[PDB]
Nucleic acid binder design. Structure first.
Lengths: 166, 82, 74, 98, 71, 83, 59, 162, 79
RNA sequence: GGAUUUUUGGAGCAGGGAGAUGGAAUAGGAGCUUGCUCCGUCCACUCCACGCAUCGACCUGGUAUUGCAGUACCUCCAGGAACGGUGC
């Protein structure tokens, strides 16, 4: 599953009200970032589950990593990534500088590599089982090298990102 | 003949309007339309068994106004001439 | 202006109308009017205790019409 | 057409209040009776009057509380006022100015 | 004459009082001859009630005043 | 001859909305027919009133005489309603 | 839009944007015609541009 | 970067997920929360996350303030005049703060309208009988650290330290 | 399609006794024979009677000119 | 451009009865202070007719569902009824 701005939490207590659980989820998600939307239903199909869509994908990833298995109203909720994109996010959308990538999948196109590097800010260019990603900023390249060291993308293989030499 | 033309010429005057629910709003009349839309600035409204509240602007409809109160120094004889 | 209400699909159908003061009637509509006046043939009104009283063909004006719910699938 | 209907119908009863400068009473829907001289009228019964006296009756409305006290009547005076024709319920003309 | 009384308060948050005693605080976007107010993301106070885009009729309107700055 | 809230109510036909009457009755459902005189005819409607008597009906018709307010979704508040 | 001689007789908006886009830097006079073909294989592979081969040979 | 009127007038304000008027004041690093009179109590929620506020005080009278987000801050003390400035304060998120002792929760008992309180990720929550002391000192709070207060916890809070 | 004006004209031609209910008043209604009508639904009842359902009494008045703004429902009776 | 869906309004008013029941710190009159007696204004409890029946929101316990969605509202059982409105 690819990371997105919407994080879905399930296995929660369905005995509480919908508005109180939505306010509790908003107060829990406000510590990690700005919550743009909160989708919570109480029907027979969507019982005991909700989701929070944030502005930045990094805040949603930090909320999914930190609150993984956290006790919520007596029941430990399980957080995961969304399968599809949110409607509000789709409506609103429409060390060294060079980093060496190893053990990359050959079936991935340049758009998937751009979407993977889009967690960091704007880079100069991308080069394509080995790849070279060069960023315009040194701190952004360092954060991209520290974040992609063992990332969860195409789980049949393991991607490794290291700093380039001179 | 038409009271709307007489009510529209009463701008920049401190008057009062009592509604059907007992709320009295006293303020300076700044805008009057053909549908008696009273737009006042720096008004004070007192509802039924409530405390008076001062607002910077207010917009009351013509159908909700029950009675009006004009000062005694208003030239009603000169304003009646169309 | 003066457009008539869309009552062509509810013609000759058993519907329940609500009137002001908490009145409830049920009957088949027999026509339409631009002033929202409905003619209900063989209408039955609900009393306060719950008994239904047949009043026959009645005419309900649009000034007191609250809500009309069609009891038949149109 | 309009002037003849205003001078020959019920509005002539208003037109006798502004021409001869007589005092008439207006009972409103808020249980208030205002007696005064009609100065300006219209087709929608918009009555702009001067030197009006409005009388009514009010209850204490749970003022102090414990099950024995009566309401009372009251009255007030206004120099010049204007009332719309929607709240005017009853209009009575009587020779009270003499 | 100018009819700029309703156009000056366009795209602003206003609180309209109803006849039954309710208060709807919302962003006034458009109007008409029948004073039909469209309040996007409006709150109902009398307690707080989540309503959102509420299209209230002009027959149940009594008074309206400015609430705050536009978002 | 057609108002902008009337055009917004006519453009919102077919969405899950609600209409609260002057007596407190909230007819909720898909707006099938919306005329210029605020006549709301809905199919598979649901009655949730201020009395609280929640029920489900096949078809409902509420006129604009006793209609107090209308709660619509925010999908049409962006465009072309931006003036 | 830059003040170009081709846009002299033009007097519109959409047309001005279309002229600034179509009459922009077309395929002619590209980015120096990059063709690096680094020595990472010495017998195959030449699609590396001026920046790909540089990053491949630096590290 | 102190909180002034020009920073509050240029800050974004919109509707939150609970259909409340919230102003996003995050990313400002305000050392002290002040100059809040420019909002004129037109916001139902206050988003002051990721700041450097040391004391939750200095706020004017705001009857419309019902939610206060003070997450990711260094709040170690609470003002005693919180009830006189926010009578309708019901939501208080004080997660990841600098509260170490339970005695800072003693000015928080004056908020009678407070029902939702968050004191997670704090050294004061790691002390012995912190939840029982928070239930005994603040009986009006119904949800403490995303947990509903039961009758057994209220009986245990009323039994000890009576 | 049966028009309400045509039904009112048929009821005036048949001269049958009809009962008219008032708007926002369920305690008292009127009953009589409609002789004529107008565009404003103004009924002219001959030997009309006001029936109070709470007190179970009937007070006759005679020729009554009932306005159409107050009559909410009208039904036909056999009496 | 005051005659049924918007602007010349169908709005106004009052909360059942009883009991040697209880209180007006500073605010009733009369028998011309204080103490007592009488009479046209509330709240708390008790009795008859918990004013009645309805549904929604809500609290305790038990119990079922582990499900990827853009929402009037959402499992069921039992007790209690602080709230809302509908008809008498």
């Amino acid at each position: 599953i690819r990371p997105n701005h919407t994080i879905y939490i399930n296995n929660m207590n369905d005995k509480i009200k919908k508005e109180e659980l939505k306010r509790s989820l908003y107060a829990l998600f406000s510590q990690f970032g700005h919550v743009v939307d909160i989708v919570a239903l109480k029907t027979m199909k969507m019982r005991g589950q909700a989701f929070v869509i944030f502005k930045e994908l990094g805040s949603s990833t930090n909320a999914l990593r930190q609150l993984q298995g956290f006790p919520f109203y007596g029941k430990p909720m399980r957080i995961q990534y969304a399968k599809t994109d949110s409607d509000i996010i789709s409506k609103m959308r429409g060390p060294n500088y060079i980093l060496f990538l190893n053990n990359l999948p050959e079936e991935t196109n340049e758009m998937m590599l751009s979407m993977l590097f889009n967690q960091f800010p704007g880079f100069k260019e991308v080069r394509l089982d080995i790849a070279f990603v060069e960023f315009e900023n040194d701190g952004q390249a360092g954060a991209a090298r520290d974040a992609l060291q063992g990332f969860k993308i195409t789980p049949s293989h393991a991607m490794k990102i290291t700093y380039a030499k001179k | 003949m038409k009271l709307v033309r007489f009510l529209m010429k009463l701008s920049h005057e401190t008057v009062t309007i009592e509604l059907k629910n007992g709320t009295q709003v006293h303020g300076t009349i700044t805008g009057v339309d053909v549908s008696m839309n009273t737009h006042l600035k720096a008004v004070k409204m007192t509802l039924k068994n409530r405390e008076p509240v001062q607002l910077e602007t207010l917009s009351i409809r013509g159908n909700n106004i029950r009675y009006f109160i004009l000062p005694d120094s208003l030239p009603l004889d000169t304003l009646l001439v169309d | 202006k003066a457009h008539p209400p869309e009552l062509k699909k509810f013609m000759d159908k058993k519907l329940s109308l609500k009137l002001n003061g908490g009145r409830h009637v049920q009957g088949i509509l027999r026509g339409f009017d631009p002033f929202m006046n409905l003619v209900i043939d063989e209408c039955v009104e609900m009393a306060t205790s719950g008994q239904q009283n047949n009043i026959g063909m009645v005419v309900i004006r649009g000034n007191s019409i609250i809500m009309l719910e069609a009891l038949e699938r149109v | 057409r309009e002037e003849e209907e205003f001078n020959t119908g019920p509005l002539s009863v208003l037109t006798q209040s502004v021409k001869n400068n007589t005092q008439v009473l207006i009972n409103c829907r808020n249980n208030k009776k205002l007696l005064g001289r009609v100065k300006a009228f219209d087709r929608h019964c918009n009555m702009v009057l001067e030197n009006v006296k409005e009388m009514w009756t009010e209850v204490p409305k749970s003022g102090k509380g414990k099950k024995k006290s009566k309401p009372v009547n009251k009255d007030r005076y206004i120099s010049k006022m204007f009332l719309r024709g929607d709240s005017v319920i009853v209009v009575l003309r009587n020779p009270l100015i003499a | 004459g100018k009819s700029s009384k309703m156009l000056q308060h366009i795209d602003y948050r206003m609180r309209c009082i109803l006849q039954d005693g309710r208060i709807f605080i919302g962003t006034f976007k458009a109007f008409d001859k029948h004073m039909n107010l469209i309040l996007c993301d409006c709150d109902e106070f009398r307690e707080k009630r989540v309503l959102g885009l509420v299209l209230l009729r002009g027959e149940n309107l009594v008074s309206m005043t400015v609430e705050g700055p536009p978002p | 001859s057609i108002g902008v809230p009337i055009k917004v109510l006519h453009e919102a036909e077919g969405h899950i909305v609600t209409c609260e009457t002057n007596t407190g009755e909230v007819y909720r459902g898909k707006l099938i027919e919306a005329e210029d005189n605020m006549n709301c005819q809905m199919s598979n409607i649901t009655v949730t009133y201020r009395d609280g008597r929640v029920a489900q009906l096949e078809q409902v018709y509420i006129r604009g005489s006793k209609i107090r307010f209308l709660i619509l979704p925010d999908m049409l508040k962006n465009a072309p309603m931006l003036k | 839009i830059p003040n170009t001689a081709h846009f002299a007789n033009v007097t519109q908006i959409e047309d001005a944007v279309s002229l600034w886009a179509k009459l922009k830097l077309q395929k002619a006079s590209e980015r120096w015609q990059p063709d690096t073909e680094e020595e990472y294989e010495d017998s195959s592979g030449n699609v590396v541009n001026k920046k790909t081969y540089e990053d491949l040979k630096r590290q | 970067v102190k909180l002034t009127a020009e920073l509050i007038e240029q800050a974004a304000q919109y509707t939150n997920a609970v259909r409340d008027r919230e102003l996003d004041l995050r990313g400002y690093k305000i050392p002290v929360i002040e100059n809040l009179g420019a909002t004129l109590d037109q916001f139902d929620a206050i988003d002051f996350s990721d700041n450097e506020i040391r004391k939750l005080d200095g706020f004017p009278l705001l009857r419309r303030l019902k939610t206060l987000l003070v997450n990711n801050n260094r709040i170690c003390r609470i003002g005693e005049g919180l009830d006189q400035a926010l009578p309708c304060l019901t939501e208080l998120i004080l997660t990841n703060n600098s509260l170490v002792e339970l005695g800072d929760l003693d000015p928080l008992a004056s908020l009678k309208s407070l029902t939702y309180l968050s004191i997670l990720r704090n050294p004061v929550t790691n002390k012995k009988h912190y939840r029982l002391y928070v239930i005994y000192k603040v009986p009006q709070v119904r949800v403490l650290d995303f947990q509903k207060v039961k009758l057994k916890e209220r009986q245990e809070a009323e039994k000890m330290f009576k | 399609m049966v028009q309400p004006i045509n039904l009112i004209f048929r009821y005036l031609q048949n001269r049958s006794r009809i009962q008219v209910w008032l708007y926002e008043q369920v305690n008292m209604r009127i009953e009589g024979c409609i002789i004529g009508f107008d565009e404003y639904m103004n009924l002219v009842l001959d030997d009309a009677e006001e029936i109070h359902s709470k007190t179970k009494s009937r007070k006759q008045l005679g020729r009554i000119m009932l306005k159409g703004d107050n009559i909410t429902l009208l039904q036909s009776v056999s009496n």
